[PDB]
Design a protein around this ligand. Structure first.
Ligand SMILES: O=c1ccn([C@@H]2O[C@H](COP(=O)(O)OP(=O)(O)O[C@H]3O[C@H](CO)[C@@H](O)[C@H](O)[C@H]3O)[C@@H](O)[C@H]2O)c(=O)[nH]1
Ligand SMILES: [Cl-]
Ligand SMILES: [Cl-]
Length: 351
């Protein structure tokens, strides 16, 4: 048996981008699960084979990492077009890994037919008719189904904690004690709405030494609904395989909520922070029942709480190390259920 995993709208090569990284990590955990898998992308590479050098129907399972189908600038996007062409030729059920709420499966043909370059493609080439199974990272299938209310062939939905792929890797390692150069740190991208609101709340005008790494930029926070005066330091996007090491430079790293993610999704960030040398502080709204760690000290409601909690950590090395000890213990407990996680995944993809 052979499995093919692809990203539906982003080229895959290495850890330079988040979409590529997530695809490679899934490829790795699936492979270490004792399954034969190939990542199929635009060209052959260390981790990939090209769409044109293989036959999609030589694979028994087709797994697709979610992506946007929108064509930036109205121009063609070969990753999207090539991926869907690949998917359309497949004659068995397609397993869609739904890791981000804003990226539900959708047909690209409707977008293509109205473009000047539509004549270069056909409905037959791009229209994916095979049945699709949405594997939601969020436990709430109502939200998952609501996101796919416009797709016809999406037959089934099933929850699976996809984001644990980093902790289950064969070469996973907790971060070790690190020299502290920051009070708080957050590595990610900007997103309008609640996420933007909370980034301002917890990262702006705190009076703390805070760094915001990733491709996010200060110019993106201009919503007058969320005013601020002093912003954290933005330092640039780094490879995804160095996130925990980066988080470790700070005393604490934040988990910030967002609409439809709260009390539904556990995000990769959770494990990257928990595994780092930085104390994990969680936006209360994101996990109201303290499902991640049953210790109120790891949660903060607002800017006031965050500042107080961070100052408490800065002045008590014992509190800091105790909390790290606690989050690391909880993480190991999750890693202990590796076999269960693997069997659950296999079940998700009908194995
Ligand atoms: O310089 C940086 C900063 C961030 N990251 C990575 O980017 C990820 C995503 O960050 P962000 O873009 O802020 O999105 P999140 O809302 O934190 O998480 C989204 O992306 C995760 C990874 O796919 C999913 O688990 C979540 O469900 C999805 O909402 C992080 O976890 C890091 O692994 C980097 O690789 N380099
Ligand atoms: Cl999203
Ligand atoms: Cl990492």
């Amino acid at each position: 048996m052979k499995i093919a995993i692809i990203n539906m709208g982003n080229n895959v090569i290495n850890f330079k981008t988040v979409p590529s990284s997530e695809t490679i990590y899934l490829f790795k955990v699936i492979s270490e699960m004792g399954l034969n898998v190939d990542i199929i992308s635009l060209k052959n590479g260390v981790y990939t084979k090209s769409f044109d050098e293989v036959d999609v129907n030589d694979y028994d399972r087709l797994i697709v990492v979610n992506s946007s189908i929108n064509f930036f600038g109205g121009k063609p996007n070969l990753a999207i077009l090539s991926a869907q062409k690949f998917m359309a030729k497949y004659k068995s059920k397609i397993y869609y890994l739904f890791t981000a709420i804003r990226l539900p499966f959708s047909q690209s043909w409707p977008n293509v037919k109205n473009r000047p370059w539509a004549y270069l493609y056909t409905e037959e080439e791009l229209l994916i008719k095979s049945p699709i199974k949405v594997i939601s990272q969020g436990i709430n299938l109502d939200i998952a189904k609501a996101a796919h209310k416009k797709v016809d062939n999406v037959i089934e939905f099933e929850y699976f904690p996809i984001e644990q792929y980093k902790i289950h890797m064969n070469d996973f390692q907790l971060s070790k004690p690190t020299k502290k150069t920051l009070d708080v740190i957050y590595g990610g991208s900007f997103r309008s709405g609640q996420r933007e609101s909370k980034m301002v709340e917890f990262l702006f005008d705190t009076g703390l030494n805070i760094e915001f790494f990733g491709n996010a930029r200060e110019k993106q926070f201009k919503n007058p609904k969320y005013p601020w005066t002093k912003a954290p330091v933005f330092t640039g996007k780094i490879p995804m395989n160095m996130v925990s090491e980066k988080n470790s430079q700070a005393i604490a790293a934040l988990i910030i909520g967002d609409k439809n993610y709260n009390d539904n999704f556990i995000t990769l960030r959770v494990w990257e922070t928990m595994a780092s040398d930085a104390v994990m502080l969680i936006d209360e709204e994101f996990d109201t029942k303290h499902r991640i760690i049953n210790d109120a000290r790891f949660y903060v409601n607002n800017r006031a709480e965050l500042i107080d909690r961070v100052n408490e950590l800065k002045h008590s090395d014992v509190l800091r190390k105790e909390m790290l000890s606690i989050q690391h213990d909880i993480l190991n407990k999750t890693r202990a259920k590796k076999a269960e996680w693997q069997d659950a995944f296999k079940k998700a993809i009908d194995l």
